[PDB]
Design a protein around this ligand. Structure first.
Ligand code: MG
Ligand code: MG
Length: 202
């Protein structure tokens, strides 16, 4: 039970700034879905990151591409998710920086799956928005341990702090799910491209 003070403080500050954080997340996702030049940029920097993780901006692009791509496997169930986690494990064996990214993405997959199998559809989507608000605040400050901690809390079923954060943003949670639907094709393609690139540098 409970959570570390750094995680409590990230939740407190994200709730104070939740109109800003949730609004910026939704608008970035809308811009990405409607701007093909932004999609090409994320994809080419993600491919560079597979060959060389040293630049934080390239590794961020790899994380964004895989966080969008993972929605496919999550909606396909246990076999697809196990294959996706197997791919992340192979990615993590490449270097210590790749391992840090892969460990974060594995926790994000597990958080999604816990929510979907235990909550109603609307509570699932709203809790996810509150969780990602805290995660984005932590990552923007370079605090990767706090970001992963928030995901672990949801894996264990402690959804209530994150649902509570996003309750007044239920409409934005629905719109963020409408936007993911426009990205299904992008995600399937980029996942196949990353899988091929990882095989090449093994
Ligand atoms: Mg290299
Ligand atoms: Mg460099």
């Amino acid at each position: 039970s409970g959570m570390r003070e750094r995680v409590e403080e990230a939740l407190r500050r994200a709730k104070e700034r939740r109109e800003e954080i949730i609004g910026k997340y939704l608008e970035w996702a809308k811009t990405f879905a409607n701007n093909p030049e932004l999609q090409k940029e994320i994809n080419e920097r993600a491919l560079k990151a597979i060959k060389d993780p040293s630049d934080e901006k390239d590794l961020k692009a790899l994380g964004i591409a895989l966080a969008i791509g993972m929605k496919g496997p999550i909606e396909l169930g246990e076999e697809a998710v196990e294959e996706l986690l197997g791919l992340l494990e192979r990615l993590g064996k490449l270097s210590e920086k790749h391992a840090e990214l892969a460990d974060f993405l594995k926790a994000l997959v597990q958080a999604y799956m816990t929510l979907k199998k235990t909550l109603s559809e609307e509570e699932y989507r709203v809790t996810y928005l509150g969780m990602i608000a805290v995660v984005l605040l932590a990552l923007s400050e370079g605090d990767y341990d706090t970001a992963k901690a928030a995901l672990e809390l949801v894996v264990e079923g402690d959804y209530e702090p994150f649902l509570e954060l996003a309750e007044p943003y239920a409409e934005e949670a629905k719109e963020a799910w409408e936007i993911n639907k426009k990205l299904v094709e992008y995600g399937l393609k980029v996942l196949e491209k990353m899988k091929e690139a990882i095989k090449e540098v093994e």
